[PDB]
Amino acid sequence: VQLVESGGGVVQPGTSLRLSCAASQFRFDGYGMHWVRQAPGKGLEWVASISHDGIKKYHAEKVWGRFTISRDNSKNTLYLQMNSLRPEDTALYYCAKDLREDECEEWWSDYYDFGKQLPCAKSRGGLVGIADNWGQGTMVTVSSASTKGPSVFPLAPSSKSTSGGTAALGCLVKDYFPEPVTVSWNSGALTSGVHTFPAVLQSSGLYSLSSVVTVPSSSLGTQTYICNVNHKPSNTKVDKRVEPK
Amino acid sequence: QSVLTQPPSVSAAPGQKVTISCSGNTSNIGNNFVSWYQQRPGRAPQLLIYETDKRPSGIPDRFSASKSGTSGTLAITGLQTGDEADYYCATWAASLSSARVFGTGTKVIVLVQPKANPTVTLFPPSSEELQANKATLVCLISDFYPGAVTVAWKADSSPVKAGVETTTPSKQSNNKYAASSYLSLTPEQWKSHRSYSCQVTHEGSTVEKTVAPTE
Numbered sequence A: 001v002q003l004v005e006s007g008g009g010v011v012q013p014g015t016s017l018r019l020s021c022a023a024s025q026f027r028f029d030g031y032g033m034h035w036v037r038q039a040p041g042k043g044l045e046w047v048a049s050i051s052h053d054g055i056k057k058y059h060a061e062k063v064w065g066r067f068t069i070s071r072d073n074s075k076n077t078l079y080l081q082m083n084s085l086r087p088e089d090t091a092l093y094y095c096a097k098d099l100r101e102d103e104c105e106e107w108w109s110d111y112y113d114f115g116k117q118l119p120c121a122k123s124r125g126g127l128v129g130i131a132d133n134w135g136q137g138t139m140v141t142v143s144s145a146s147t148k149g150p151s152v153f154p155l156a157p158s159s160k161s162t163s164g165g166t167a168a169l170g171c172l173v174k175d176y177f178p179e180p181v182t183v184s185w186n187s188g189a190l191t192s193g194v195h196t197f198p199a200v201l202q203s204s205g206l207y208s209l210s211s212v213v214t215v216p217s218s219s220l221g222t223q224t225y226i227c228n229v230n231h232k233p234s235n236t237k238v239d240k241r242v243e244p245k
Numbered sequence B: 001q002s003v004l005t006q007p008p009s010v011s012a013a014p015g016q017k018v019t020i021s022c023s024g025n026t027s028n029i030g031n032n033f034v035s036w037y038q039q040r041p042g043r044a045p046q047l048l049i050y051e052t053d054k055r056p057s058g059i060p061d062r063f064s065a066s067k068s069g070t071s072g073t074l075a076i077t078g079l080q081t082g083d084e085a086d087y088y089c090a091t092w093a094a095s096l097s098s099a100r101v102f103g104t105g106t107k108v109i110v111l112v113q114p115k116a117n118p119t120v121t122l123f124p125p126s127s128e129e130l131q132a133n134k135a136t137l138v139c140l141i142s143d144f145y146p147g148a149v150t151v152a153w154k155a156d157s158s159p160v161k162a163g164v165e166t167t168t169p170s171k172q173s174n175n176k177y178a179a180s181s182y183l184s185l186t187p188e189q190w191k192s193h194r195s196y197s198c199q200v201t202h203e204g205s206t207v208e209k210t211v212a213p214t215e
């Protein structure tokens, strides 16, 4: 069994987009199908379901009136029409096969050539809501964003980021698109005690990450600390001074 | 827009047993079959259990499940490192939208290293960001094992739901884990409270950091 989703991409709020899913290696028109989505780092969520024949349709409350599932059994294709897209529709969209076949219960055969079965006379089986095969999914990112280099804000060392002895300071790399950025300190001369965290995709559809470094609190008056931020998609390189308080 | 509640994480040593609960309501689990899905890191889900206790052909008898009243339970015995994954329960019925739901998901961790307690660092909004009419609190969590934390935010002593964005834990170079949580506030919200706190729970122990507009 093989399911291959397509149609995803970056799209602005309020627009429309149609996802597709192509089925292979099973009898597509004998099985119901599902769409399931997963926002980045979050849980699975039902989106829509459709009977093997395309007649019965079911949609999740969050998408009522905006999304419509459909299928074309002459093309082994499942569709999801997504209108009036919202930032909270950002997610990986999975296509999934339903378990229960519209299984033939009575069929005749070519009398002499009885390896050839004739069109099914009677069948039964509808949607049971068990997703037995899943595609790898297609990503849909809803955001107003165009290629954008980051804003950088200092995370200043204070009495509340000191324990000792040691002080913590950092920079907040805010509102860039797309991934990735790289961060260094003092043009690469400071590497001990540095930690750069993976980004979060914000509901605004822009990324943010932070980088923090632990240093002697005695040094805060003598040593300059500068965080260097590279964003290749926008060809920007920025340096930000981080000083107390 | 209902949910089946699951524990955020469970863990055990190799060869041991874990259970994962799935708590719902009469409308979903109470009247319907429960199914379970396994999702390995970076992969698509795979069906584990259907019709409450039935295994598809490839699934070993180390996995079993049941239900009682409005709650379902998955059990994994002889736990092995390959079982590390997120596990989701689910119900689906044609009758009502509220019977079509997935659980919140449970990460199963197989413990192959000693526990390590997180370092937590909390930063307030910078003056520069506030001059731009925005405010972000930054809670950074590093050097912990196993790789699961929950983060809660408080304004004074009141829980804050809106504005929180938290990353999934990611393995560091030393094979421990890191994560971060961001609370987006307006300047007014930041300045109008006596303090904000980030509360990090790791293996049932909660540690807390606090920052205040008046430094």
Ligand SMILES: *[C@@H]1O[C@H](CO)[C@@H](O[C@@H]2O[C@H](CO)[C@@H](O[C@@H]3O[C@H](CO)[C@@H](O)[C@H](O)[C@@H]3O)[C@H](O)[C@H]2NC(C)=O)[C@H](O)[C@H]1NC(C)=O
Residues within 6 Å of the ligand: B024, B025, B026, B027
């Ligand atoms: C399981 O589902 C049932 C309903 O399917 C839930 O029971 C009902 O919960 C709602 C809240 O979403 C209650 O409605 C509220 O009632 C109060 C009191 O009259 C009213 O002030 C609100 O305007 C709102 O309408 C409802 O009373 C309550 N009971 C029934 C019989 O529907 C239940 O909370 C769910 N969870 C469980 C049982 O754990």
